[PDB]
Amino acid sequence: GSHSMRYFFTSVSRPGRGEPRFIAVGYVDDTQFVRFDSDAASQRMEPRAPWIEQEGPEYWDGETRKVKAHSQTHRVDLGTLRGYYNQSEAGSHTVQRMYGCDVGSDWRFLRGYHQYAYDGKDYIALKEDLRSWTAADMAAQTTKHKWEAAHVAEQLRAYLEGTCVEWLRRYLENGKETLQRTDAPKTHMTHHAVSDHEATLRCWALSFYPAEITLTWQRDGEDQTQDTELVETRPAGDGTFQKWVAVVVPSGQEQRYTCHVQHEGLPKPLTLRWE
C-alpha cells in the first residue's frame, strides 16, 4: 500500500533563562526512526529503529547539523512571532512544524506537505500544488510575502518530490523486514453485566500494524452506532497498536450483535460474535 515519511518539531520558549526546549522526531509510516531532544546529553540526532543504524557517520553528522539548524530557526521564529503579535517576554509560547511526503503502492510521489503553527493555531502551510502558501492572518501574510520573494516554495518542492521520496524508498528497503510487514489485529470480545437487564459487549483489536483500522458493530446485519463507544487508537509500546469498540445491549440479545474488523493485514474483513 501507500507509505509516508514525516518529521515533527516542537519548540517551547523558556522566558526566564536560556534557549527554547526543542524536540524533533521522524517517522516512516507509524514507526519512529530518529529523535533529537535539546535537553538530552548527546546533542546528536539519535537512532530509534534498528534499520537506521545501517547509516554511517556522515549521515549522523549531517542530520545533526540540519536538526540544530532547524532548532535555531525555531528560536528566531519565537522572537519574531512575539513581535508580530505584540506579546510580552513573560509567557511561554510554542511553535510546531510538520513536513514530509506520501508515496503510493508503486512508491512514486503522491503528496507533499509543510505546515507551521504558533501556540497551537494554524500559521502558514504549503498548498497541495507545492507552489504557494496558505496564510491564516496578517502576520502569516507578511511571512508569505517574505517566502515568495525568496522562492522558499521552490526549494521545498524540490526536497518533497526528490530527496524525501528517494530517502523514504531507501528506508523502506533497508527496514523491509518490519516496515513492509503487516501485523493483523488479534481480536476477541468481552462481556459485562451492568444490571439484570443491560449488558456491555467490547470488541478488542490488539497487536496490529499499521495503526489504521476500522471497528464497527452491526445489529441483525445493519450498522449500529447508537449506544456504542469507540476509543482512540493507542500505542502498545512495542511498535504495535490497540483499539476497542463497545456496545450496550439488552441482556439475552447478545447474538444479534456482530463486530466487524477491517485492516490491511486482513485480506478480507473479519467478523466476531459473543459465545
Binding site: I23, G120, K121, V231, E232, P235, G237
Partner: protein, 100 residues
Amino acid sequence: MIQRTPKIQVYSRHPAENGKSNFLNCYVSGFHPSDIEVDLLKNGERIEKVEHSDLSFSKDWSFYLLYYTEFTPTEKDEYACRVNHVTLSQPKIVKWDRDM
C-alpha cells in the same frame, strides 16, 4: 491562548496475567500546551521508574505522550495514572481496569 484538556487511557502492553511481567501504560493525548505532569501509581503511591515517549502531535496540532513502566500484575495491587495540566483544576486519576 488555546487550551485543550488531555484525554487519558490506562492499560497494559500485553494481555494482563498475574505473576507475568508486563508494561503499564498511560497514554495522554489531545492536549495543549505541551507542559504536562503524568504519574503512574501503585496502591496510591507514585512509581519512581517511569519512562515516556518523545513529544509529538496530531494533524490538529494537539500533543500526545505515552508514559510506561515495567510491572508484574498481582491479584491485589491496584494501579492508576495521575495527570495534571493547566486545563485541570485538580489532578485527574484514572484507574487501570484489567477486566475491560
